[PDB]
Amino acid sequence: GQYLRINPDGTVDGTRDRSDTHIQFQISPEGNGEVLLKSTETGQYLRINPDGTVDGTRDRSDTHIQFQISPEGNGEVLLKSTETGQYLRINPDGTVDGTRDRSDTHIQFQISPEGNGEVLLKSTE
């Protein structure tokens, strides 16, 4: 299982190093049961693009940063891009993309509180 990471250059991947500074996220309520996922280190929001890539942006007006967190028992949740209907996936190789099949083995996350309001997004594997 890997921690979701938004790098300073805007790329998104996974990592097992919990000491990385780019895995801490601020989840800000948006209404509609929708939220934003903001990497506090760089001020970048998690974004799923319609083509399936995942990256970071500071553009708060961007429509692809809105997410729905959907609980799936056992502590796990899914993270769905509202605008494209894609679920966040962290692949075994460490790459991060979007998929529209809810049956995928790598789209389930466990949210881990850091103690300061910020949370880690860790893939269950």
Approach to solving: X-ray
Token output for 113: 């509180």
Q: Which amino acid is present at 91?
A: N
Distance from chain centroid for Cα 19: 18
Residue appearing with tokens 């790459």: 95
Q: What is the CATH number of the domain that holds 43?
A: 2.80.10.50
Give the DSSP letter string of the chain.
--EEEE-TTSBEEEES-TT-TTSEEEEEEEETTEEEEEETTTTEEEEE-TTSBEEEE--TT-TTSEEEEEE-STTEEEEEETTT-PEEEE-TTSBEEEES-TT-TT--EEEEE-SSS-EEEEE--
Neighbouring CB atoms inside 10 A of 106's CB total 20
CA–CA distance from 87 to each of 10, 18, 38 (Å)? 19, 23, 17
Expressed in Å, this structure's resolution amounts to 2.2
Q: Can you tell me the distance from the alpha carbon of 125 to that of 78, in angstroms, rounded to the nearest whole number?
A: 14
Q: Can you tell me the distance from the alpha carbon of 120 to that of 26, in angstroms, rounded to the nearest whole number?
A: 9
Instruction: Note every long-range contact of 101-104, with CB atoms under 8 Å and residues 24 or more positions apart, other chains counting.
Output: 102/78
Domain extent at residue 9: 1-125
What's the number of domains the chain is made of?
1
